[PDB]
Symmetry: C2
Subunit: 215 residues, 2 copies
């Protein structure tokens, strides 16, 4: 991704989302759009963004249903123009395989979320994360998501998935993660609030890139 | 819930969804709407259904994000008219509390999904499910979702949450679960494909209710 930086566009109204994304477009090539924006403005916002900014769109829907419903969610999401979708691994292998089958049919990609970045992830997800990552490898998953807030866990995840897999990581900025440290293990960092709630989003994005290039 | 039966309306186009829900409305008072329909037709479909059928709407979004995003998802979902939202417990207590705080602010309800009904749930979720249920009790959750496909697990979940909590259960019909056995522990059963893919959805719903009333 351009500059190894992915914008998590979680503003909830179209006008603000369009303004901020346009202000930082020169510093990224990939926008992560999730339910806060889609449930507020509609799935058509994905194609509008993709077209208007000529960026790749990752739908961060953290898919976590049974196989049959996961297939339907992935189909609707790719039909809407998304390039990739983020799926939870904790529901198990059949749920993840359902997403991979649709991505294969539609020429898109699946990112497997292993361990989450917030405090509560320590309760149940962390203990299963190494196994979820190994399950991903066994299924042929090549794209993964891991926590910026726990670089030692990000390192262990990178260890399991190997150097050829692509790893992106949220939790930078607002949640406490560091761009530089996270990029020791992840290929790209996801940043939301530190950029979109900033008084000057372009300056915030630029400042992060400056740290990155220095690496 | 009328007849202890909740329709899982997962068709993906408005016309078919409206037709089937109208055909079975005399047998239910609650419709569960999820992402297959919402991502295909828009969040406005919730208010349309609520008005048209005068039914309660449970948004089955299996929310599974960090606290901050979960709040935004719940706010957008209740703004759209949903009476309740289903939330995953696996992500931890802070993620669940974020949903409860928004439900409290907006006068709505949160249903906590403990163990899922599909085969893959055995990999990671099942082993944490009793603890997720206890966490729910500790947080003051009063509405839960458990698996029709494993009545012995449904019994154990009922044991943890007590008789006063409300428990609904998916996996009846297509996934192999039985209405009668599931209702030994759950207050209501969720049924999707067995009704909406039937040649006569009203007859399918009626048949289920007849086996229920005989309890």
């Amino acid at each position: 991704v351009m500059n190894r930086l992915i914008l998590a566009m979680d503003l909830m109204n179209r006008d603000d989302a369009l303004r901020v994304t346009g202000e930082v477009r020169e510093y990224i090539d990939t926008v992560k759009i999730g339910y806060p924006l889609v449930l507020s403005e509609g799935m058509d916002i994905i194609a509008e963004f993709r077209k208007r900014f000529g960026c790749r769109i990752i739908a961060d829907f953290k898919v976590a249903d049974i196989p049959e419903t996961n297939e339907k969610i992935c189909r609707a999401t790719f039909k809407a123009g998304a390039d990739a979708i983020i799926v939870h691994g904790f529901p198990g292998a059949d749920s993840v395989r359902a997403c991979l089958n649709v991505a294969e049919e539609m020429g898109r990609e699946v990112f497997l979320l292993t361990e989450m970045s917030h405090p509560g992830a320590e309760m149940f997800i962390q203990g299963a994360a190494d196994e979820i990552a190994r399950m991903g490898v066994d299924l042929g998953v090549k794209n993964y998501v891991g926590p910026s807030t726990r670089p030692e866990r990000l390192s262990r995840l990178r260890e399991i998935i190997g150097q050829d897999s692509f790893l992106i990581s949220p939790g930078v900025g607002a949640q406490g993660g560091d761009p530089g440290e996270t990029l020791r293990f992840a290929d790209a960092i996801i940043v939301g609030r530190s950029i979109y709630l900033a008084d000057n989003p372009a300056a915030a994005a630029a400042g992060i890139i400056e740290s990155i290039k220095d690496l």
